[PDB]
Design a protein around this nucleic acid. Sequence first.
DNA 1: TCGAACTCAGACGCGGCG
DNA 2: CGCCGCGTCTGTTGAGCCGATG
RNA 3: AUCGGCUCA
Lengths: 586, 1340, 49
Amino acid sequence: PPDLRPLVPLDGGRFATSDLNDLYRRVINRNNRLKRLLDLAAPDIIVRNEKRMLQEAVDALLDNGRRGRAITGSNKRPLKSLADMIKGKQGRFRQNLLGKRVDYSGRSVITVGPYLRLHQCGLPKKMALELFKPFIYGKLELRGLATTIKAAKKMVEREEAVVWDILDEVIREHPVLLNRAPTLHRLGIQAFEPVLIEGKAIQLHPLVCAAYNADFDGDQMAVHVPLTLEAQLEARALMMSTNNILSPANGEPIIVPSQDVVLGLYYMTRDCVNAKGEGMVLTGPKEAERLYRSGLASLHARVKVRITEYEKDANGELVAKTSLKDTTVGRAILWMIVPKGLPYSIVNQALGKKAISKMLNTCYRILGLKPTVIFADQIMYTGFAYAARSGASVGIDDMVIPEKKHEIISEAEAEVAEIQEQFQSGLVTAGERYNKVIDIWAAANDRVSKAMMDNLQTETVINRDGQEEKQVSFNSIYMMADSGARGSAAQIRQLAGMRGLMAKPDGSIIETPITANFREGLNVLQYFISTHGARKGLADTALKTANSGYLTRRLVDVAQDLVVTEDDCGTHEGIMMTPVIEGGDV
Amino acid sequence: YSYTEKKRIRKDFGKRPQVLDVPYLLSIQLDSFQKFIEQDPEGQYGLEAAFRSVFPIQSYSGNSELQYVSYRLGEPVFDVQECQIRGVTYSAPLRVKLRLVIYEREAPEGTVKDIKEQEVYMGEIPLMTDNGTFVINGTERVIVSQLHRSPGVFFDSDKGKTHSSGKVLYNARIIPYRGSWLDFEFDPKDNLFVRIDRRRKLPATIILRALNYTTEQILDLFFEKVIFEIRDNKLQMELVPERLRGETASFDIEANGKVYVEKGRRITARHIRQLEKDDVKLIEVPVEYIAGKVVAKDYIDESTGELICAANMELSLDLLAKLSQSGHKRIETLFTNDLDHGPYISETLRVDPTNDRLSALVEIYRMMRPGEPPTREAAESLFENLFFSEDRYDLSAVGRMKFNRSLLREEIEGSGILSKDDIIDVMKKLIDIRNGKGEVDDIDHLGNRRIRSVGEMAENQFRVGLVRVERAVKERLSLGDLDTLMPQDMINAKPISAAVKEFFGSSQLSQFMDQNNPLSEITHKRRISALGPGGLTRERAGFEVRDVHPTHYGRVCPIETPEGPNIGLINSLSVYAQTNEYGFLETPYRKVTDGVVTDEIHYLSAIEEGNYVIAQANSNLDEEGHFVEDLVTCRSKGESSLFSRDQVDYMDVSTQQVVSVGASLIPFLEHDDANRALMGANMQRQAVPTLRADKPLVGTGMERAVAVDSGVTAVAKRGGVVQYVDASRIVIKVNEDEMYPGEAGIDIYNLTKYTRSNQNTCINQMPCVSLGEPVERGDVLADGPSTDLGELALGQNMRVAFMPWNGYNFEDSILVSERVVQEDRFTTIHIQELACVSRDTKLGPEEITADIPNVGEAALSKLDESGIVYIGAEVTGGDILVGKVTPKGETQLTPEEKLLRAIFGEKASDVKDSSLRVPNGVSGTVIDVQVFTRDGVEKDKRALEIEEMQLKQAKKDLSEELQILEAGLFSRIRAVLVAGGVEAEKLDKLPRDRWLELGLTDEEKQNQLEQLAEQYDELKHEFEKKLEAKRRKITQGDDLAPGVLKIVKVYLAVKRRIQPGDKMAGRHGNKGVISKINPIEDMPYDENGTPVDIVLNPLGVPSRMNIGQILETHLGMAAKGIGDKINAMLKQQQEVAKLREFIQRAYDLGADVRQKVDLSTFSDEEVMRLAENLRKGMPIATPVFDGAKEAEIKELLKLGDLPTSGQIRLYDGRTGEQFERPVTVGYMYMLKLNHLVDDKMHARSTGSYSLVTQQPLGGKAQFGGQRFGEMEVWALEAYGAAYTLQEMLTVKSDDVNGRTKMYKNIVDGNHQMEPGMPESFNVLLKEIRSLGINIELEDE
Amino acid sequence: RERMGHIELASPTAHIWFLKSLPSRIGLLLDMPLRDIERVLYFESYVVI
DNA sequence: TCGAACTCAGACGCGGCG
DNA sequence: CGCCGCGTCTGTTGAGCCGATG
RNA sequence: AUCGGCUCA
Ligand SMILES: [Mg+2]
């Protein structure tokens, strides 16, 4: 029919039409002219050629570039047959029938807000005033402020305060769906509950950025609303944010506290050897709070307090026991949020992020779900608050070069010179010299790194009530690398010791290694050699995603159908499981 | 020190003396085009090659011909600015000189019949503006260089395509500039193969027979044989001693009269030694030695003529009798061994079905053109015009050089066409590389890739146009009259114009020029792409091309490239790189002579760099002598090591020719990682020019060159002293020495106020000099969009103090204060363009008028009589800009309504309206309205007003020019009159006009009065004719596309400022997205009252290792302390001597810096204005790899009384307590970026719908809904939700009845759903059942 | 959007999909090779019924 | 109907020929 | 049975912008 | 509506 192949007008009397009209005109003309030549009984060769040209016109209409060469349009581009309005990434089955466009939606730029609770998100005023329009019309007409629809249109556009009151009424208890593309796995879209703010950006909780894989440096996010009454209950009971906190790939929790809260939890619960209020006794966590806040005691200075802890070892009900424990002041501040079912030895340690994750998991095992949600949120709040209150900056005095670094490199160079001398006298072969040189450089690397880390970790020497003691350090780089916020040992080694040997594009290992680091600055061709590996990494990261996405598609398309249908199949024996520690250890 | 240097001197910390200074940043376009159009006399470059390559054309019969002579370019009708306002191309006409001579057919050379001589107009060619950009239909446009594989020969080896074999396969290739390729190849069992243009594989040697030369001659050329004699009894073989080598003996080798070598005995070196000491070559051998051999030369029965054995064929022992009896006393054979001389040619022969030339040509001919009969002419023509015609195959000037060099000939140049010897040599060296001699080439070498730029591309396109014309010239010349045929008639200028105007504006490489910065220009013009016509594609290119090669050192930047799909395909040219004469890249170096680094500089290519040994810039030169330390670091043959003090040959020039210009502007580049520096150098090009620009406190010395050479600031043309300065023009008066004696010597600069940049930002210029102060040639007189006193200043520098703060800077987020928004130091201007056109419909013409049917009087206050908005009225989305009505059908009527419509009196042709309106969501303040009209349409009132205004300004400018000209000239014409006596009291008493009438003396002064009158007359004639010319050019009607009557064009201008969600970033690659705007109180305040302005996050340094920003912060805080100290000295009004002493103390601080500024020379007012300019903070410089060190930066910090460590005590804003630990504080320099929020947020509830498939449109421009791709559908199936995607598949997208009834229910208070069928499904049903397939769905 | 039309061809033609798709579904039925069917339908030879 | 197109590449199944 | 050669068919997902042509 | 080009995560 026509409307399946329109002929759209232009600005200036021009017409843009699909290629189908062109492909049809050619066949119509060939048909008419061949009928003419057939009536008059023209000599044979005219009939032969005319019939063959009719053949070509038809079987170019069916699908263009198959039999011979494709019949191009004006622009040296092939035409669009019927059989390629169904194929490809642009056809019907994939572009227009499995994924629609959708209205009642919007998109914008994300940014953080830490005053939320993890079943909430922010909406700018005007996005929410554009999405929820008909609900507003209904409420106005029901209240009797507007008689007809046009009155409601104008009252909404002029933005009179009653509109803001009604809008605040409507969105209550009405979850929306937030999405971020690409959506690799089922935790990619979740159902939040709005809070209206002013601005232009969709605020979002911190803890649920690990599931989306979102960073706040320019990402974008899309918002949909559910209309009907069943879909609203589905967005509440199946895909809310507080209902799925175990990943379906493997039951490991998915709300690990990320990168800044952990440093606060790690700076509260640690011990100095001298601070103040050394060795006086308290009566509970509350007097510890009063003492730390009034400025009579330091946030971490070892003390002994009295605490009351609850175990529910009985038949499902709690029993209380009290005692004098030997702890700092920071841990006695934490004990105010652990929820009445946990032993006190959860807190007596310096809380790197493994300890925090165990803390949450143990709460989940014993007390169920709701206490875990409340407790996780309180951890986020207190971590932020007591991490800002310390002040923790990084300055060029923190990158500490080991003192014994001239000797190591000088010795290594002497050794390589001797091996070169022995080679030039012919005693040793070609490859043997190469191998011995790389081995000696690797050994020098290792002992430089070990000297560095023996200088960073435990070198604060401080004295109290006597002569001298050594304790673990308070060097900002070391706290950011030990607790687990950011970094690791290898990358501190990049910043302070030698930065290793570098490889050339072929894959070989170049002979003379880098020797300077990022505090001393490095030379010209040392930089020009780092560039090799840097570009190889960058070029690989950009050309995985193609066949990764392709593989995911093929898998989803094979495993599509299967669903769990019956209760018990009644079959007999299956397979057998044994450990696979084989080769080496476990 | 120039006159813009005594204003504000920037301190250098560099320590290496400089030998070569950076060249003109963008020479490559200018030189390429400039040698495209120049008139070369003899050495064809440019257009003259293109003509002289189609050197005269004769007829099919040869009865006449026309001969090309010369050419010239007219002058353009319009200068650039008019050509950009108007909306037309900027071009020049091409006028060619031609002669047609007619030579008679009766006489053999009766040339004296006719000689017609004239000029011919054909085509128009665009020109290059002064900077390097074309204008094409009014939008400035830039075309990018290309980097492709050099034409020539090429060897390599695939790693066993049939990899099951596991054996490498070699091959060779010939590729010319214009023609058809040629490939030679092996097969998994060693049989040579050829192929032409990737056709079917053919067994080789078929070319060898196709040269019409058979086994004998050519395959004697190929092998050189082994000599035998049949001495009437037996066989003797001649043994050259150096033949039996690495071999084994089958019987006891001996001589005619001695025994030499035993049986079963390999021929060691001593055996050859003995044989050559014995001087014996002829040796009797058993005839079994011939059992196994092969013949070499064809031997026949000399009586009958029967071939005993064709050349290069097998033999036997009865054939020994045959050869001896026929009269052959000698036998030539083959010295064959697969390890040395394998029978690859031999097997190739005994697989070829062929014997003579005719069979080979026939087979090829029906191969390439199957079907058509192979007549003798057809076969010969196909094989000649394929490889051996100068018309259809040409290598190059460069291809021949590369060819002859790769085969180790001697003579560089020769013929441009293939021949026999070349193919023979390619085959021989390919077999040679097979046997173990030599080795393959590689592709990424910058000695096999060539750059091709504007001049060459345009030359090729215009040659294509020329040959197309030559066709029709040959056609028409042969037939018609000759004696009355003027040449101008028989050309057509259409094809040249079509080809050229298609390439300059439709090709793969003509692009817009990103006008965000000065960086964006002079990085978009120095760019080297690898795509386009004749190159790769984003999917073909593998992993070998995208990688860094050891030959990029000093020719192409290694840390500058995009991040998307095309990583290594486009990359920017380095700082000092030239281009050779052929096209390969070149780099400077300094010559070393006997340990002394001399001063003369040599440029080196990409292949000669490998022979020598090169030092490095960081090698500590020992004060004019040789190098200090023994084992100087060097590099050669593409590897680095330690060498002596005498072996070195060259030392590279400057410490920074390895990097580009985009990435030599970031300080402390040497400290931070590679890919973080990539992100920094790649988002420094996206800043936005703010209101008032501010210099950077820490730069890398190369600000000034980029700001000047980018051609965006108005530079002085000739020296002088400023005459008149205004906000929109400056008039300068030249010195006497620089004035050539024609004119009066005034220059006039018209600055360009607010204007659109084709990324929708604001371009404007500000005068930079006061009134009455001198100006020397080369200075700057007007800062550009984003400069500051001639220094590139690209963003603003703020006090940052970074530490974690209540999680409002969790991941990369920022936290700006709220007096960064009060001071307006990040707002920007954005202007926008809207247009309205009126055409001629079939019914009739449109109109532009204020009487629009069916509009309330309210919206028509803001239109004048002519129906166009006022200037200055501020509009908001939805209003009217231009009032237009479109006539439509006229139906006929009855007399009664005629009476009525004549009383009420309103209309003849009830008429639609289609006026222009502001698309919703836009606002602003109109600032400029332009009106274009044809030549023949009556000019409405407002266009008349506008043109009259513009004439008024033009006449003011012209009279001012000619009037200050004649102010000098009238000082002259007042001085000259004074001669002839004095009338001192009456001289100025009477009006100056009455100076031609007073007392006259005969002997000379009649000539004086006569010349008064005369020069007045010519002056007035020049004035009037000049003004008439200008008025004619202004009032001139315009030209429009067919069917258009007149078009108006309206601008708008908004003002955007900071709010949450909006992006920022530093120079080192630390992005971020503002998170909160925080009152003044809450900002942490140091011990003295002053708060902070940004609060970054310290958890972002250790994990990405961009340690640049910490040191940059410390220098910031060091460089502001001195500014504060000068401010204190200067408000308190101290004295001059103290300022002199302190400032001189600040410029002598480094270890061994090269800059030494002595200001005991400066005069007192100059010192005072310098101290005025530094009171905001002393600027500092730090070249890229020769930076400042921690000792020097700490000496600075200790000069201004600041803590040496770098970090201070910060209190808190809300509670008044002290932060537990010290905190860093300093001055970062950070940038806007134009990923604003106001261009991203979008929201839809109901709107348009498509036409063919009935589901909502897409994109913000046309108010569409988002997309729910199949990945989200899988996500929503995994959960188990089934109602939700039924909702998203039918009643929000396609089901028509469903959506209307859903809206009804929602507004009615009932939340339910009645679904149907997505009607694009039944669209699919009809598309399938249209093919002849009966898709149709059963019923219940 | 719903009504259709038709052209009546003067002489029969051959559907591509049932000829040039892989194994031809015509050459498999008649059993004669593909090349013969093209060379008949390209108007190059005759064939005996 | 002359005018390009080029060195994607990896895998699979079929039509000829031994 | 076993090479050996030939024409189809695949290659991430959402968005933003501006020329070109009909 | 198609095509080419630049850019974001
Ligand atoms: Mg991101």
